[PDB]
Amino acid sequence: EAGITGTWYNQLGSTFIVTAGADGALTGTYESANAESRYVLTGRYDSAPATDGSGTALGWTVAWKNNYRNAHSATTWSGQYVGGAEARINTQWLLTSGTTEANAWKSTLVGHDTFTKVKPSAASIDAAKKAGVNNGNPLDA
Amino acid sequence: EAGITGTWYNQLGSTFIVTAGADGALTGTYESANAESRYVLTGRYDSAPATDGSGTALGWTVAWKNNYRNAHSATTWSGQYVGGAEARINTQWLLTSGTTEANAWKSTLVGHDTFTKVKPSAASIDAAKKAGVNNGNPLDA
Amino acid sequence: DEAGITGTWYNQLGSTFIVTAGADGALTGTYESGNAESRYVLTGRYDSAPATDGSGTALGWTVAWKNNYRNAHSATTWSGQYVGGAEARINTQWLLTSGTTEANAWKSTLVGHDTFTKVKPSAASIDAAKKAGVNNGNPLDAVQQ
Amino acid sequence: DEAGITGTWYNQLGSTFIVTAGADGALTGTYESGNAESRYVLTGRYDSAPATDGSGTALGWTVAWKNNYRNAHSATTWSGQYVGGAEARINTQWLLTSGTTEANAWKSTLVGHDTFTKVKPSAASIDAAKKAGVNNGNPLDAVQQ
C-alpha cells in the first residue's frame, strides 16, 4: 500500500509508476529509462495480505497503444511485492499480440521481470544487460 | 469495443462481465457459474486494432479478495478478442500467490482459458469438464 | 502407462508424434508437422509409476527443430500429463525458445498449450481447429510445406 | 557448443546438473538438488548447429521427478538458450507439471525461470539468491533433505 505506491525500476531502467488504492486498485504508467514511450497501466493487488512473511499478490496490464504508437499488443505482469530495505516486485509476464488465426501460435511471449525502488546504473544497467534483459515491453513501446 | 463489452463465459461456466471504454480501459467483475464469488477486475485493450483480420490484444487482472474471502493471490489473463458469429477471447493466464521467499518457486501457476458469448450447458460444461477444466480461479474464489 | 503412452498421438491440427515409453521412464520418438522434412527427434521423461488415485501421469519432452533437412534454431518443450481411458489424452503447456542475440533475449520464448489424443482428426475437425486459432508448438519454419 | 555445453552447471541456489551434449543434438545427464536421493535422470535436445550471428543456442530438457528412492509424481521441462564465453550461461523458462485429478488439472502446472552458469556459487551467493526468492524448477518433495 504505502510500500507499493511509487516508482519502480526494472533490470533495464524501464519505469513503472503506480498508485495502490485502498480498495485494491493499481493505476499508473509504464515507460522507458519520454511521453512517446509512456503507456497507461491498470491492475489489482491484495489490499489485506497475510502477516506471516508472505508477499503481496498483484498484477497489472499495459496495452501498447498511446497517442504516439500502437504495437497491437498487451502485456500482463503477475507477481508479488516483497517489502523491506530492498523492496522488490517479482513478476512473470505474458505479451500477447493481436494475430490472425493462422499465426495464433506465435501470439504470446513469456518472460520475467524484477522491479526495485532504486534506479540502476548503466554499469549494472548494461552488464546485467549483457546478462539477458527481460523487458515485457515490445520494441515499439 | 461494442464486441468486447458484455458478458463472457469460459469452458466451465465461469463468468467475465466487462465494459470496454473508449480510452482502452477494461472494467468489470469475474465470478462463478453469487456475490461471494464475485471479484473486481480491471485491464486494458487495444482500442484501435489493425484491420487485417488480426485479433484485438487485451489483458486484465483479478485480485482474489472481496468482502467474503481472501485467497492472497491474483490472476492475470493475456489474450486476444476475435469477433464474429462465434466471437471468442482466447487467453493464457498466470495465477500468483503471495508466498514466503522459500516457497517462491511454487508461487505462480500457468494455464489457458477460452471465453465465448454463449453460456455452455452442463453437458459440454461437464464433458469438456472431464476434458480438463482450466479455471484461472483459485478454489477459494 | 508404458503401454498406454507408446504409440502415435495427434493434435487437433494433425501434427503427429510417435513415442515409445520405456520401462525406466524414457520417452523416445519423433514429432512431425507428413513428410520427412518436417520430422524431428524427440526425447523426454515420464512418471513410470504414477499415483494410484485417479491422477494423471506427469511427463515432458523436447524437440530441437533441427533435422537433416532444415534448422529453425529453436527448441520446444512440452510439459503435461497423460490421462488413459477410451478417450486417452495428453494435455500440455509448451515453451518455444529461439536462439537470439542478447538484445532480443526478452522475446526469445513463446508459450502456448496443446492437447493430443490417439485419434487422427478429420479435415473437418482440422478445419474447426484452425478456426479456433492454431495452438501448435512447432515454428512454421520447421515445416516443409 | 558440444564442448561448451557438456559439463556441470549450477543455479544460484546450488542445484546442479551434469550433462553430456552429443554431436547429434542429444542432451543426457542428471539433475540434482548433493546426495543420490535427490538425483534424477535428465534428457533433452539442443541445436547442434546454431546460427553464426551472435545468437544463443536453443535447447530444452526434461526431468521426471522419480528415481530409485522417491517419486514426486511430477515432471519439469526447461526451455532456454546457451550463451558461451568466459561467463557461459544457460537462461531458461520452466514448466513443472504434477499429475492430478481431472478436477485439479487447472492447478497442475507451475511456471518459473532459472539461470545456470559453470561456476559453483558460494554460500554467500547462495544466501542472497534465497533472499531474492528461490527460482528452482524442482519440487521440494523431490529433495531428500
Give the containing element (helix H, strand E) for D4: helix D2-5
Residues comprising chain A, all counted: 141
Contact B98, B138 (CB under 8 A): no
Spatial neighbors of B84 by CB under 8 A, at least 6 apart, are none
How deeply is C4 buried, as exposed, middle or buried, from its count of CB atoms within 10 A (0-12, 13-18, 19+)? middle
Q: Is D29 on the interface with C (CB under 8 A)?
A: no
Q: Within its chain, how far is the Cα of D123 from the centroid?
A: 20
Which residues of D are less than 8 Å from A132 in CB distance? 83, 89, 91, 115
Helix count (H) and strand count (E) of chain A? 1, 8
What does the alpha-carbon distance between residue B30 and residue B17 come to, in Å, rounded to a whole number?
Answer: 6
Contact C76, C62 (CB under 8 A): yes
Q: Is C66 on the interface with B (CB under 8 A)?
A: no
What does the alpha-carbon distance between residue D130 and residue C124 come to, in Å, rounded to a whole number?
Answer: 52
Indicate if the alpha-carbon torsion angle A101, A106, A110, A115 is positive or negative: negative
> What single-letter amino acid sits at C57?
T
CATH of residue D33: 2.40.128.30
Contact C33, C141 (CB under 8 A): no
DSSP helix, strand, coil percent of chain C (3-state; round to 5): 15, 45, 40
Q: Is B81 helix (H, G, I), strand (E, B) or coil?
A: strand
Q: What is the DSSP letter of C68?
A: S
Which residues of A are less than 8 Å from D90 in CB distance? none
Q: Is A84 on the interface with B (CB under 8 A)?
A: no
Which residue from D minimizes the CA distance to B98? D133
> What single-letter amino acid sits at B108?
T
What does the alpha-carbon distance between residue A80 and residue A74 come to, in Å, rounded to a whole number?
Answer: 20
By C-alpha distance, which of B109, C40, A97 is closest to D25? C40
What does the alpha-carbon distance between residue D27 and residue C66 come to, in Å, rounded to a whole number?
Answer: 14
What does the alpha-carbon distance between residue B133 and residue C82 come to, in Å, rounded to a whole number?
Answer: 15
What does the alpha-carbon distance between residue B16 and residue B114 come to, in Å, rounded to a whole number?
Answer: 11
By C-alpha distance, which of C2, C10, C30 is closest to C87? C10
Q: Is A131 on the interface with D (CB under 8 A)?
A: yes
**Hey, of B76, B105, B126, which one would you mutate to test binding to chain D, going by the most D CBs within 10 A of its CB?**
B105
**Ramachandran assignment for D95, one of left (phi > 0), alpha (psi -120 to 50 degrees), beta (any other):** beta
Nearest-by-Cβ selection for C134 from A101, A129, A134: A101
What does the alpha-carbon distance between residue A111 and residue B110 come to, in Å, rounded to a whole number?
Answer: 12
CA angle, residues D14, D20, D23, in degrees to nearest 5: 145
What does the block give as the cell for D92?
Answer: 531458461
By C-alpha distance, which of B140, B111, B136 is closest to B12? B136
What does the alpha-carbon distance between residue A85 and residue A88 come to, in Å, rounded to a whole number?
Answer: 9
Q: How far is CA D13 from CA A135, D89, D116, D117, in A?
A: 24, 15, 10, 11
Which residues of D are less than 8 Å from B108 in CB distance? 110-112
Q: Within its chain, how far is the Cα of A16 from the centroid?
A: 6
> In 10 A of CB A5, how many CB atoms?
14
CA angle, residues A80, B98, D100, in degrees to nearest 5: 120
What is Dmax (Cα atoms) for chain D? 48
Size of interface C-D (CB pairs under 8 A): 196
Which residues of B are less than 8 Å from D102 in CB distance? 129-130, 132-133
| CA-atom Rg of chain C in angstroms | 15
The answer to whether the CB atoms of D71 and C49 lie below 8 A apart is yes
What does the block give as the cell for A2?
Answer: 504505502
List, in sequence order, every residue forming a beta bridge with D123; answer none if it has no partner: none
Query: Strand (E) positions, chain A?
Result: 6-10, 15-20, 25-31, 39-45, 56-65, 70-82, 88-97, 108-116
Indicate if the alpha-carbon torsion angle B99, B102, B103, B106 is positive or negative: positive
What does the alpha-carbon distance between residue D28 and residue D18 come to, in Å, rounded to a whole number?
Answer: 8
Report chain breaks in chain D, C–N > 2.5 Å, as residues after which they occur: 33
Question: Which residue segment(s) compose the domain that B66 sits in?
Answer: 1-141
Query: Strand (E) positions, chain C?
Result: 7-10, 16-21, 26-32, 39-46, 57-66, 71-83, 89-98, 109-117
Q: Is C129 helix (H, G, I), strand (E, B) or coil?
A: helix
Chains contacting chain C through 3 or more C-beta pairs under 8 A: A, B, D
| CA-atom Rg of chain D in angstroms | 15
What is Dmax (Cα atoms) for chain B? 48
What does the block give as the cell for D47?
Answer: 541445436
What does the alpha-carbon distance between residue C92 and residue C76 come to, in Å, rounded to a whole number?
Answer: 12
By C-alpha distance, which of B115, C121, C139, C62 is closest to A105? C139
Phi, psi of D21 (to 5 degrees): -100, 120
> What single-letter amino acid sits at D117?
T
3-state SS, B86-120, equals CCEEEEEEEEEECCCHHHHHHCEEEEEEEEECCCC
Parallel/antiparallel/unpaired status of strands A6-10 and B39-45 = unpaired
What does the block give as the cell for A94?
Answer: 505474458
**Ramachandran assignment for B106, one of left (phi > 0), alpha (psi -120 to 50 degrees), beta (any other):** alpha
Q: How far is CA C65 from CA B97, C60, D116, in A?
A: 35, 16, 23
> What single-letter amino acid sits at B139?
L
Contact C80, D97 (CB under 8 A): yes
Spatial neighbors of C75 by CB under 8 A, at least 6 apart, are C62, C63, C64, C65, C96, C97, D45, D46, D47, D58, D59, D60, D79
What does the alpha-carbon distance between residue D143 and residue C58 come to, in Å, rounded to a whole number?
Answer: 18
What does the alpha-carbon distance between residue C17 and residue C33 come to, in Å, rounded to a whole number?
Answer: 9
Contact B120, B114 (CB under 8 A): no
Give the containing element (helix H, strand E) for B40: strand B39-45
Q: How far is A111 from chain D (nearest CA, A)?
A: 8
What's the resolution in A?
Answer: 1.5
Size of interface B-C (CB pairs under 8 A): 21
For residues D68, D71, D74 and D77, what is the CA-based torsion angle, rounded to 10 degrees? -30
C38-77 per-residue burial string, b: 16 or more CB within 10 A, e: under 16: bbbbbbbbbbbebbeeebbbbbbbbbbbbbeeebbbbbbb
Contact C24, D68 (CB under 8 A): no
Spatial neighbors of B59 by CB under 8 A, at least 6 apart, are A61, A63, A74, A75, A76, A94, A96, B43, B44, B45, B76, B77, B78, B79
> In 10 A of CB A36, how many CB atoms?
12
Which residue from D minimizes the CA distance to B127? D102
Nearest-by-Cβ selection for B109 from D107, D134, D140: D107
Phi, psi of D23 (to 5 degrees): -75, -20
Please indicate the experimental technique that yielded this structure: X-ray
Residue with cell 540502476: A120
What is Dmax (Cα atoms) for chain A? 48
Phi, psi of A65 (to 5 degrees): -125, 130
> What single-letter amino acid sits at D43?
T
What does the alpha-carbon distance between residue B44 and residue B133 come to, in Å, rounded to a whole number?
Answer: 26
Indicate if the alpha-carbon torsion angle C79, B95, B46, A6 is positive or negative: negative
Q: Is A128 on the interface with C (CB under 8 A)?
A: no
Residue D9 among known ligand-binding residues: no
Residue D46 among known ligand-binding residues: no
The answer to whether the CB atoms of C111 and B92 lie below 8 A apart is yes
Q: Within its chain, how far is the Cα of D40 from the centroid?
A: 11
Nearest-by-Cβ selection for A112 from D83, D89, D113: D113
Residue with cell 510445406: C145
What does the block give as the cell for D29?
Answer: 545427464
Give the containing element (helix H, strand E) for B42: strand B39-45
The answer to whether the CB atoms of A107 and B65 lie below 8 A apart is no
Q: How many domains does chain B have?
A: 1
> Alpha helices, DSSP H only, in B1-140?
122-130
What does the alpha-carbon distance between residue D70 and residue A119 come to, in Å, rounded to a whole number?
Answer: 45
Spatial neighbors of B24 by CB under 8 A, at least 6 apart, are A40, A63, A65, B44, B45, B46, B47
What does the alpha-carbon distance between residue D2 and residue D22 come to, in Å, rounded to a whole number?
Answer: 6
Chains contacting chain A through 3 or more C-beta pairs under 8 A: B, C, D
Spatial neighbors of A56 by CB under 8 A, at least 6 apart, are A3, A4, A45, A46, A49, A80, A81, A82, A83, B98
What does the alpha-carbon distance between residue A80 and residue B109 come to, in Å, rounded to a whole number?
Answer: 13
What does the alpha-carbon distance between residue C40 and residue C42 come to, in Å, rounded to a whole number?
Answer: 6
By C-alpha distance, which of A87, A99, A4 is closest to B57? A99
Q: What is the DSSP letter of C33?
A: -
The answer to whether the CB atoms of A132 and D91 lie below 8 A apart is yes
Give the containing element (helix H, strand E) for C120: none
D54-81 per-residue burial string, b: 16 or more CB within 10 A, e: under 16: ebbbbbbbbbbbbbeeebbbbbbbbbbb
> What single-letter amino acid sits at B76?
T
What does the alpha-carbon distance between residue D59 and residue D27 come to, in Å, rounded to a whole number?
Answer: 9
What does the alpha-carbon distance between residue B108 and residue B75 come to, in Å, rounded to a whole number?
Answer: 9
- Please provide the distance, in angstroms rounded to a whole number, between the alpha carbons at the two ends of chain B: 28
Indicate if the alpha-carbon torsion angle C115, C116, C119, C123 is positive or negative: positive
- Please provide the distance, in angstroms rounded to a whole number, between the alpha carbons at the two ends of chain D: 34
By C-alpha distance, which of A12, B10, A75, C82 is closest to D97? C82
Q: What is the DSSP letter of A132?
A: T
